[PDB]
């Protein structure tokens, strides 16, 4: 249970950052940060909590892969 809520809060925070960057696309601070690579890095951040959900799941043939 504890990793689940930690991961959920992580997902919510990452979503907030992504949404605010989309809404403020043309501002100097956002443009100076390498937008096209910023989104890739944020996807990388998003994947880890899904990794939590995968490791808590029941072992199977698909889940091992």
């Amino acid at each position: 249970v504890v990793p689940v809520f930690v991961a959920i809060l992580g997902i919510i925070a990452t979503t907030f950052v992504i949404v605010t960057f989309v809404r403020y696309n043309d501002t100097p601070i956002v443009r100076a940060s390498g937008r096209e690579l910023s989104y890739v890095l944020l996807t990388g951040i998003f994947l880890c909590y899904s990794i939590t959900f995968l490791m808590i799941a029941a072992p199977d043939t698909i889940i091992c892969s």
């Binding site: 100097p28 443009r31 100076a32 390498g34």
Partner: protein
């Protein structure tokens, strides 16, 4: 294809290779347009950079400059001004020791008003919307010695300030940087030049380097 045609294609390929090499060599040089009044101290600045059109190549810290000059071209500037659309920067001279003088035998024309008119024409031209300007305000020593006997009210009726080299020079500088109506695309680098200054090449180097980096950042969509 005959043997003669094969020789012709060989020769054409050699010519293409030579042209590509020459173009790559020419793409890495800073091109400067030197503008100003005839007596605005252009000659001294030209002398201390290098240690129809007149061309002056010079190098600083492993970088090259060509520095074209069009002072001796008495004709319509609208006809040939577009040949300089892609230059890196524009250098403009003012000669502050001109606010109490007249020019062109008009006998009612302040020299500095003519300089401001020329600056306004060049800064807001259609071919120069994203080209930075290096403004040299030279002959400042004559201004310092002269400012005591004559006040700034001859050239500027509204001054509301003191007669000192600290406030009048800044007043003239803020007049030239207020004629720019494109503050969000270009910028003006102002420097005070004088006899035996010897530090103007480095100022030009810094300004041009900042211009190059800003252009490269804007091309990436990173600025």
């Amino acid at each position: 294809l005959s043997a003669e045609d094969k020789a012709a294609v060989e020769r054409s390929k050699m010519i293409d290779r030579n042209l590509r090499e020459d173009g790559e060599k020419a793409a890495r040089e800073v091109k400067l347009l030197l503008l100003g009044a005839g007596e605005s101290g252009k000659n001294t600045i030209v002398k201390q950079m290098k240690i129809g059109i007149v061309e002056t190549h010079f190098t600083f810290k492993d970088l090259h400059f060509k520095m074209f000059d069009v002072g001796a071209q008495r004709s319509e500037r609208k006809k040939w001004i577009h040949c300089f659309e892609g230059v890196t920067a524009i250098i403009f001279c003012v000669a502050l020791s001109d606010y109490d003088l007249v020019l062109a035998e008009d006998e009612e024309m302040n020299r500095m008003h003519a300089s401001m008119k020329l600056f306004d024409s060049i800064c807001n031209n259609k071919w120069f919307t994203d080209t930075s300007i290096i403004l040299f305000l030279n002959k400042k020593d004559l201004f310092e010695e002269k400012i005591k006997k004559s006040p700034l009210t001859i050239c500027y009726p509204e001054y509301a300030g003191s007669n000192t080299y600290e406030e009048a020079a800044a007043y003239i500088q803020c007049q030239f940087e207020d004629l720019n109506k494109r503050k969000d695309t270009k910028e003006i680098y102002t420097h005070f030049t004088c006899s035996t200054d010897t530090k103007n090449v480095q100022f030009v180097f810094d300004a041009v380097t900042d211009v190059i980096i800003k252009n490269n950042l804007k091309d990436c969509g990173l600025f």
